[PDB]
């Protein structure tokens, strides 16, 4: 009973997610998936590939809970398709990063795809 | 000055003298400054070893044993600092050899003693007045034995000081903030710095990353401060050296210590209870062809904290295993499991100890992700125990994957969980069968605690609630916190009862802390410096234009400042 | 422990009706219940699992509900060979436990049987000992008397019957009553009668023969 | 096929044991249990025990001190071994596998074992014919004076079996058992159709088969 319902949007619901981390991926169509963004939900710790490094301002919210993806200055680079995940994080796990393999999520979207 | 990395092999030989000789080349090849220790060893007999005069520092010990090498030309060691001894004290050894070691400049040994023994074609060496080299806190320990064939050599030239010289002619023959002579009174005049060193001036200590600042009685960061890169501070860290828990570089993280990135200097921060440790569960990689955890693979999991794959306990585990070659397993090493907290694959448990109650190592484990499953089925399956709890208070998450519990017939409890509260994945199901009947249970007061919320528990014990009735202080539920009374003094956040800053002394009817931090409580229980309460004044504390700022106390015991002029404190 | 009490002991019922079975436990189990036929000289056969969940291969007018500690068994339309033995099984405390069972019987109508009789063979004759059978055959209901009468004679304690389990598919019964005599005493006598009074017979129909 | 084939003696003296095998076929003695049920006339349906896939075993408490189940994964068999018996455990004893891993209700059920506790004897029986008279046609077979039960009847190797009634078996004065078989025919094929009945009681290893003309 975890949700993402999204559309950028994606509205977090299921679990109080104390120590989560939710990301973006990117789903090519000649290829396979790849790392976006991501977040921590217990701390406002951030991580991107260099691709778009700089580019995207993706943050959280008010109240629990919803994370959005700023996608400004869009580059005809990153066509392929968004994903939204989310996972739990062990205690035992830094507190200040954030996992990147698509492996390393257990809850995903349904995938939004928008184009520019 | 060139820095290479050092070496503590000790007394072994790496291969080939040759092939020694090769990597010893490498290793010191142009090195000026040596991080950690100096061996040389093995070393053959007409080997170009002229490379070692460019040599002009050691921070760990020196150690030259086993040459047959006529001549070793350390002619511009000037100093070894001993920060590690080879064997017991010493930071020079030199054991059973070699005919010439002219080390005409080594002038300062900041700390360790000397050992020479077993060295039949040295010469001169004999003569050195160690009492000016080594620290005479070391002389206790010194070890000195020289002899030869006859002891046939050359002569020290009467230039010399009481004939003293480590071989022929007479090439061979200050104070504060220094440790390696002196060209002139200054803190520049020194060819080797002593406490530390920054850009020719010496000094005691690099300038410290942060600084107090009795202007805000608040902790600044002082930008003219570097960080302390061995002997030397550096502005930043170099290439892949990483900065400690103060201040200074090193090569990698510590073992209880992990790597963080604060902007861009990657940092070591401590590590929040045992370390990260991923290991392999059974049926993957180092344990492909394994049926369960035995008696052979056991040890294989110790300081481990995550586990990618799942994690069996069958009865042949308990058995043993001939066909496989592995003992029964002894029940108490299932207790190395008790640092697991994170499971990617399933848990499944067909045994278990008879004499044990519940399933007690794994009372830290707090998910199972279910990314593997029994019978594509199962994340969790718990049958055919004899176990009275289950026990997995810590567990808060089963994020895929059925759970089945069955057969224990003594397992109580478990029915007052809701397990849905633990569930991420939608379609996720309880099986939870065949166990003790909950009437048989609440005959002999097996029940939840009262202290316990309606969401269950894991067992009797109030620290195994799902959540608690009034509140919580750590693990425990409890009817409340230490408001006004109690031992530990506490406030609240978040329903859970926190401990109050230890240096705040604690109040008759009233609460004695609003806060985690020292300046959050009424009344300290020792001294005052401004907002916080502290256990004892800043007496040597380094702040702005590097002046080390002295207080001193009072009748009241507030921290007051010290006249400028005190540079010992009040 | 816990009990699982089944109602009623017996159940008689004409085709077409509807039919409940109960089983109450003693204690709250949720739906952790199972239920099984059992047919005559058979091993008891799966229904219901989990109270309600339906198993393949099943007639689909069998039907399970009920939870907590009240649990039903029901049948959409019964029919013949529904004539079985029907068990409740919890699946909560340990170990699992059955109920004692509920015989479901059904009604039909009146149906007359039909009577043979047969002599002592000779093979056993030879062996020192005579046995006489008599067969009613698919008759309805079971309420039947046979009467030996040998020569005229109303036997009585060398007799034993036998009634068979009600029909799969005419649901009716049969029996077989055997009289046993000496070879001597069988052969002291002439004519062996077999009387057979029944609900579907206006008169008793009698079957004999002479030695 | 999921399949479940017992073999085993039935009759046992007191305080002797009883022992039946469970040879399986269908599944693997890996992936599943084997749980032993019993049916008492009297005492209903009791589970005694189980072997689980790991060849560890439980036991209803009645029975933990008198009972073992062992088993052999390859041979693809389980072993049921009770010990010293009584009166009170004459009852069909069953092999059972759940319909799901680790569970409870039971869709694979072995043909049972009839178990009988008693200090007499195997007796085989004989079998005579029941002739049809000369006027539907009724004959049959009477299976007389054996002991214990059962004894399993057919018609022609089991090509008869519409129309055929084994009613069950009744209790002599002897304390041996009588048995009748009776198949109702079309008396237009009596001449025509020849008639057999084959009857097999294991106890004694008697199989027989005998024309009803
Ligand atoms: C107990 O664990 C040991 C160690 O993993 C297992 O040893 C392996 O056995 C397999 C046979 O299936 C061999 O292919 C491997 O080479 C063995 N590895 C080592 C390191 O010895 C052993 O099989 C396990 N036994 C049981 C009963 O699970
Ligand atoms: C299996 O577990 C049960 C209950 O956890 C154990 O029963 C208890 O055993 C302890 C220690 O022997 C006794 O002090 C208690 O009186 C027992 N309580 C009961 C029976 O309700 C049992 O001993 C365990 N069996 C084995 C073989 O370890
Ligand atoms: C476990 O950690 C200790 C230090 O706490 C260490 O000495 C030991 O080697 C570790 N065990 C391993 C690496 O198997
Ligand atoms: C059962 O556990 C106890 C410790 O509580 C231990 O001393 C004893 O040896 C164990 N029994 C075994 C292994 O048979
Ligand atoms: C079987 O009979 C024996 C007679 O001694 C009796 O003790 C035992 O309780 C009986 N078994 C039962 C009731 O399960």
Redesign the pocket.
């Known amino acids: 009973q975890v949700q993402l319902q999204e559309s950028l949007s994606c509205a977090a619901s299921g679990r109080t997610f104390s120590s989560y981390a939710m990301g973006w991926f990117r789903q090519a169509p000649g290829k396979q998936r790849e790392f976006v963004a991501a977040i921590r939900w217990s701390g406002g710790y951030t991580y991107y590939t260099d691709s778009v490094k700089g580019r995207f301002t993706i943050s959280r919210d008010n109240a629990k809970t919803t994370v959005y993806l700023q996608m400004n200055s869009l580059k005809p680079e990153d066509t392929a398709v968004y994903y939204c995940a989310a996972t739990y994080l062990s205690s035992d796990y830094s507190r200040y990063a954030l996992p990147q393999r698509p492996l390393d999520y257990d809850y995903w979207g349904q995938g939004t795809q928008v184009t520019v | 000055k060139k820095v290479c990395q050092g070496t503590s092999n000790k007394l072994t030989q790496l291969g080939t003298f040759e092939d020694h000789f090769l990597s010893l080349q490498r290793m010191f090849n142009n090195c000026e400054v040596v991080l950690g220790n100096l061996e040389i060893t093995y070393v053959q007999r007409n080997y170009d070893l002229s490379f070692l005069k460019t040599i002009q520092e050691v921070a760990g010990y020196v150690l030259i044993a086993l040459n047959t090498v006529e001549r070793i030309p350390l002619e511009n060691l000037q100093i070894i600092r001993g920060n590690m001894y080879y064997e017991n004290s010493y930071a020079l050894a030199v054991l059973s050899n070699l005919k010439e070691l002219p080390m005409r400049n080594l002038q300062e040994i900041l700390h360790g003693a000397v050992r020479f023994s077993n060295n039949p074609a040295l010469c001169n060496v004999e003569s050195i007045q160690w009492r000016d080299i080594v620290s005479s806190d070391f002389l206790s320990n010194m070890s000195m034995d020289f002899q030869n064939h006859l002891g046939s050599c050359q002569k020290c030239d009467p230039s010399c000081p009481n004939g003293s010289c480590w071989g022929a002619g007479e090439e061979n023959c200050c104070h504060n903030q220094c440790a390696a002579g002196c060209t002139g009174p200054r803190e520049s005049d020194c060819l080797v710095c002593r406490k530390f060193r920054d850009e020719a001036t010496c000094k005691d200590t690099c300038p410290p990353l942060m600084l107090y600042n009795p202007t805000t009685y608040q902790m600044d960061v002082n930008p003219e401060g570097k960080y302390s890169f061995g002997a030397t501070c550096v502005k930043k860290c170099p290439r892949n050296y990483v900065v400690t828990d103060h201040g200074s570089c090193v090569r990698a993280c510590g073992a209880d210590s992990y790597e963080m990135e604060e902007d861009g200097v990657r940092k070591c921060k401590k590590c929040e209870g045992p370390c990260r440790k991923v290991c392999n569960g059974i049926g993957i990689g180092?344990?492909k062809?394994?049926?369960?955890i035995?008696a052979?693979?056991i040890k294989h999991f110790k300081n481990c904290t995550s586990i990618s794959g799942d994690l069996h306990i069958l009865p042949?585990?308990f058995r043993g295993?001939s066909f496989?070659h592995?003992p029964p397993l002894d029940p108490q090493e299932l207790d190395i499991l008790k640092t697991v907290k994170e499971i990617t694959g399933f848990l499944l448990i067909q045994a278990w100890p008879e004499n044990r109650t519940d399933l007690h190592a794994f009372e830290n484990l707090e998910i199972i992700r279910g990314r593997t499953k029994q019978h594509g089925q199962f994340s969790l399956a718990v049958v055919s125990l004899n176990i009275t709890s289950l026990g997995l208070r810590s567990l808060k998450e089963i994020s895929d994957g059925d759970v089945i519990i069955s057969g224990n017939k003594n397992l109580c409890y478990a029915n007052t969980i809701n397990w849905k509260k633990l569930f991420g994945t939608s379609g996720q199901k309880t099986k939870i069968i065949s166990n003790r009947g909950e009437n048989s249970c609440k005959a002999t007061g097996q029940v939840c605690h009262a202290l316990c919320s309606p969401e269950g528990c894991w067992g009797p014990e109030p620290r195994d609630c799902v959540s608690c009735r009034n509140v919580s202080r750590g693990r425990e539920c409890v009817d409340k916190c230490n408001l006004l009374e109690g031992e530990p003094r506490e406030f609240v956040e978040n329903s859970e009862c926190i401990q109050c800053h230890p240096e705040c002394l604690p109040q008759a009817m009233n609460i004695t802390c609003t806060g985690r931090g020292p300046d959050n409580c009424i009344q300290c229980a020792h001294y005052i410096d401004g907002p916080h309460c502290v256990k004892t004044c800043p007496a040597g504390v380094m702040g702005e234009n590097n002046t080390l700022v002295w207080k001193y106390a009072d009748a009241g015991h507030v921290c007051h400042l010290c006249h400028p002029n005190c540079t010992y404190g009040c | 422990d816990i009990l699982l009490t089944q109602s009623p002991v017996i159940l008689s019922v004409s085709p077409g009706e509807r039919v409940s079975f109960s089983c109450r436990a003693s204690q709250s189990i949720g739906t952790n219940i199972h239920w099984y036929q059992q047919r005559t000289n058979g091993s008891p056969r799966l229904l219901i699992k989990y109270a309600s969940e339906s198993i393949s291969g099943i007639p689909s007018r069998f039907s399970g509900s009920g939870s907590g500690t009240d649990f039903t068994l029901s049948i959409n339309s019964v029919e013949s060979e529904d004539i079985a033995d029907y068990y409740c099984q919890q699946n909560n405390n340990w170990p699992t436990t059955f109920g004692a069972g509920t015989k479901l019987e059904l009604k039909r109508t009146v149906a007359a049987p039909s009577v043979f009789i047969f002599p002592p063979s000779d093979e056993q004759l030879k062996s020192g000992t005579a046995s006489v059978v008599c067969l009613l055959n698919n008759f309805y209901p079971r309420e039947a008397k046979v009467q030996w009468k040998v020569d005229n004679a109303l036997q009585s304690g060398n007799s034993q019957e036998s009634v068979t389990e009600q029909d799969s598919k005419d649901s009716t019964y049969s029996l077989s009553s055997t009289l046993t005599l000496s070879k001597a005493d069988y052969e002291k006598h002439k004519v062996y009668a077999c009387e057979v009074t029944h609900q579907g017979l206006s008169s008793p129909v009698t079957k004999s023969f002479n030695r | 096929q999921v399949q479940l084939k017992q073999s085993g003696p039935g009759l046992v003296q007191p305080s002797q044991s009883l022992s039946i095998t469970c040879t399986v076929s269908g599944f693997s003695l890996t992936n599943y249990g084997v749980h032993w049920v019993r049916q008492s006339p009297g005492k209903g349906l009791e589970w005694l025990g189980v072997i689980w896939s790991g060849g560890n075993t439980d036991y209803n408490t009645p029975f933990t001190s008198r009972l073992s189940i062992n088993k052999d994964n390859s041979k693809s068999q389980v072993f049921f071994k009770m010990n010293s018996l009584q009166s009170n455990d004459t009852a069909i004893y069953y092999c059972a596998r759940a319909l799901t891993y680790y569970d409870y209700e039971f869709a694979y059920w072995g043909q049972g074992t009839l178990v009988t506790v008693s200090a007499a004897s195997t007796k085989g029986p004989s079998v005579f014919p029941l002739a049809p008279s000369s006027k539907t046609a009724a004959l049959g077979c009477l299976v007389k004076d054996y002991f214990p039960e059962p004894v399993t009847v057919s018609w022609n190797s089991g090509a008869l079996t519409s129309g055929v009634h084994t009613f069950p078996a009744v209790l002599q004065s002897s304390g041996l058992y009588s048995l009748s078989s009776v198949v109702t025919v079309p008396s237009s094929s009596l001449g025509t159709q020849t008639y057999i009945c084959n009857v097999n009681h294991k106890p004694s290893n008697t199989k027989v088969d005998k024309r009803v003309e």
């Open positions: 180092e344990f062809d394994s049926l369960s035995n052979t693979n042949v585990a295993d496989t592995t």
